Symmetry: C3
């Protein structure tokens, strides 16, 4: 078909990439789209089975060229490119991949074979990012969420600004989106005919398990507790009682999570988020930074953590550690050793002053009622 | 058909309404009923696609007359009237509506066309309330819950007493009720044949989303967290981690809800119910009144609010504000300004004494351990 | 068929039970198994419609004999016996039961008729326990969980050690297990063809309601909040907001549960677990015993209970009662009366010292900030 060898294939990629203003995508994939039942141009959800991040640039070149080949004008100076796939695009791409078709393990190529076989018009779209800027489309928002939940990129590392304004608030029935106006328009007919769909939730975001397959040692005991865009390190457990992991939040190592992790909050390896505990996400103020809890921290049942914590910190059950809470310092000499740059000159510190320190133990003196910050005895050893 | 003009229609309504003891219903609609799999006279659920409250009295007259026309004796001195619809009732009503049949937007008339088209015996029932008293039927309980959840009537404004005794505890599978005795009777057959239905919950009440379509700016991130009979003002968000809205509870303006709103509790516009916070519903005692939180209140993560709060109150994360908790008053002069009738003569107040006041800030002194009630600095401005 | 009378039947049982080394099973039943989509020898779940505990030993003898009759070597010195049923086994058993076949109410016999009618190879397995030791199979783990959730045995009374290591972490879609590797292997095909299954959770354990039918006065308002192996006494209510009942945990009488009951924790009749409260399961240390809360205890919203409590204890909302928390004792003379062996000589006690006592009221002094242990005034009366 003119691409007969892998050498021909590589020269083709070189020709494409030497086109004027060509930029290699930083992320790309192909999404199956769910459209509005009433407004068929409204994209309600995008699903990917393969995410490419800073990889497989040849495959991206073939896809971009399929579009260029039929006259689609790609602005390589825009942050992203989204385009509906036609059958001709799939056939063009598969012909460029001719040298590989009888081989196993080429995942992007396998995906195209599948899409060709299941092709429908306006069902599939190529989605790519040229840079990390605010999303301009539902499709690019979904690619970004996937980049986070598949852990191709670290938590907080990509731009999600404006996502809420672009996404439609919809009903979700067995993880399928339905326009609210469709339900209103059909309510009499559906209820009287006993065909009213079962609505699990109404929101702009889907759940993690509608999109991501956990590692074999990762457990999520209830889907409603992990939003799409959450990032769970292998080995994490999310218990169902009073937990939550929001988008652009999660764990960077195996943790037991029984409480609530707000957006922008990161919990380090070996930490234990107790039943009904709260971890807030963003510190107050205009340059208010994100909250991180370090490694091997123990957050008690029904506690609240409103500041960044370093490693080996303990918040006792029931304690609220907020930015403005005052604490009486104990164990200053030992804490100095774990925290050599910090000035332990005084006796009372606000939560915010103590942010990020290691080996802290937040507790209440049960006789005097004083809030204390002390040494986690285990943190010295 | 003898009703040929809208004038004929209006004279018919006048004749009906001049019948002896006739009362216009205060609320009415037509429900599709779910009956027991074993006990077919047991009504397990009622679904409405249209609720009429203090409106469309002509339409109610036509329906009541359909029944009277065939000899049904309506007691207009009872608080409610419930009756199974026959095809003849639907045809009678549609014939009285003849002058309107080629016009759009007559919702009660459209509903009848649909019911005629999907008619089944014992499937549909007319349900109306003549006054606001204790429900006497499953059907009237469901009409009352709908009146609350559709916001046709305000929270706490209607009589729900006895509802629990009338409703059957059932299993619910994809929002369909199943008698527990049916599951017991069929368990061997169903499990061994691998046809055991998926049971989502066992209770007397259904969920809100099985019945109500939120406004486009209202989100409920998990159906199990909003019971049928809840009332959510447009713009409310219910997060899934540790929240709840019970029946005859909710919000009167757009609020962020991440905690638990008990029955009878009302949360005012702009308030923020923090993650895992509790709002209790009814004050203790025999004349113990319902708890209301006013506008723009901020309830901290893992707090407990056991008293009514006025506007612009703050409960810090972790604080329990109970009827018997004692608080040390600060900022008395400024609080007097926001609360001119209250007597700020003393220094220690019980929670219950402070009920309903504006601009309160409940906090703990972290050095002395004292519970404080102070000024919310933002409430002066 | 040679077993023609119930007398013949009883002599057959005598002959079987006199076989060398025969032991009567302590528990038995027949499970329908769910196997791996990829690994068909992996048992992902077992479902029973009938559990026998210390009963119906004749029926167990007939089943064991069906296997022995065809040469299966049963080790009656092992703790358990598991074996796949063949049609011949079912037909053999039904022939031994000939004298009963035209009679009603023989549940084990009815089950065999059903299994014969729905027979499939490798679908059904006989599962029995000869003693209470660590489970050796998925099948025996499931029998043990059933023994707990059906309340045939008391909470904590049976050996579940090693269960986590034997169970596979799987995806669950409408309560059906799916191997994660199957989802990975089929992800492209399933997502692009729009056939991706709805995954409710990923875990090693199923939910209670996938297996157990509550009593008519028992309510569970959300299935994800009660794990399989939980034990709920008749009349219990599990609310959905922030509750949980883990395996080998629950209630021994009717309780209102709105908080989290950890594994090994037992809550006594008439107790009320408030919204977002935590009950921990096992005391710290190597001989750290299980936590029990007695009858008519009141655990406040957002409290934490980390010690065993006797009867009529109160933990105020927001209070954390941990093993190491210190409390100032009040009402010593009255508490002595309720607790005659305890030595109320001193003024400050650690939580752990107070374990199991009756009539305790844990509260905070809101003026001094001191943690108090006092008399529950209602407990004297
Ligand atoms: Cl100081
Ligand atoms: Cl005073
Ligand atoms: Cl909680
Ligand atoms: Cl002492």
């Amino acid at each position: 078909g003119m691409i007969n060898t892998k050498e021909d294939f590589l020269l083709l990629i070189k020709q494409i990439e030497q086109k004027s203003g060509y930029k290699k995508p930083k992320a790309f994939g192909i999404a199956r789209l769910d459209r509005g039942q009433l407004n068929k141009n409204k994209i309600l959800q995008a699903s990917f089975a393969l995410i490419n991040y800073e990889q497989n640039f040849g495959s991206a070149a073939i896809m971009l060229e399929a579009f260029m080949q039929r006259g689609v004008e790609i602005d390589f100076n825009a942050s992203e490119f989204v385009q509906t796939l036609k059958l001709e695009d799939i056939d063009f791409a598969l012909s460029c991949f001719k040298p590989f078709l009888e081989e196993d393990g080429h995942q992007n190529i396998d995906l195209l074979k599948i899409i060709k076989d299941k092709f429908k018009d306006d069902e599939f779209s190529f989605v790519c990012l040229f840079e990390d800027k605010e999303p301009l489309s539902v499709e690019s928002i979904y690619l970004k969420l996937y980049l986070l939940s598949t852990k191709k990129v670290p938590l907080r590392s990509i731009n999600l600004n404006g996502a809420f304004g672009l996404l439609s608030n919809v009903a979700w029935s067995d993880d399928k989106p339905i326009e609210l106006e469709y339900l209103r328009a059909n309510e009499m007919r559906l209820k009287m005919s006993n065909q009213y769909p079962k609505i699990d939730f109404v929101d702009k975001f889907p759940r993690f398990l509608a999109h991501i397959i956990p590692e074999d040692n990762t457990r999520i005991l209830e889907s409603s507790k992990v939003r799409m865009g959450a990032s769970l390190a292998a080995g994490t457990t999310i218990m169902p009682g009073a937990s939550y992991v929001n988008f652009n939040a999660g764990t960077t190592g195996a943790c037991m999570v029984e409480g609530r992790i707000s957006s922008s909050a990161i919990v380090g390896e070996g930490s234990d988020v107790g039943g009904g505990a709260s971890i807030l996400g963003v510190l107050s103020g205009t340059s208010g930074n994100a909250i991180s809890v370090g490694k091997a921290c123990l957050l008690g049942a029904n506690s609240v953590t409103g500041i960044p914590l370093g490693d080996n910190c303990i918040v006792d059950a029931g304690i609220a550690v907020l930015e403005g809470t005052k604490f009486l310092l104990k164990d200053a000499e030992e804490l100095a050793k774990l925290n050599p740059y910090f000035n332990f000159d005084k006796e009372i510190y606000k939560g915010l002053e103590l942010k990020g320190l290691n080996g802290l133990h937040f507790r209440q003196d049960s006789i005097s009622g004083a809030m204390i910050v002390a040494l986690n005895k285990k943190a010295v050893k």
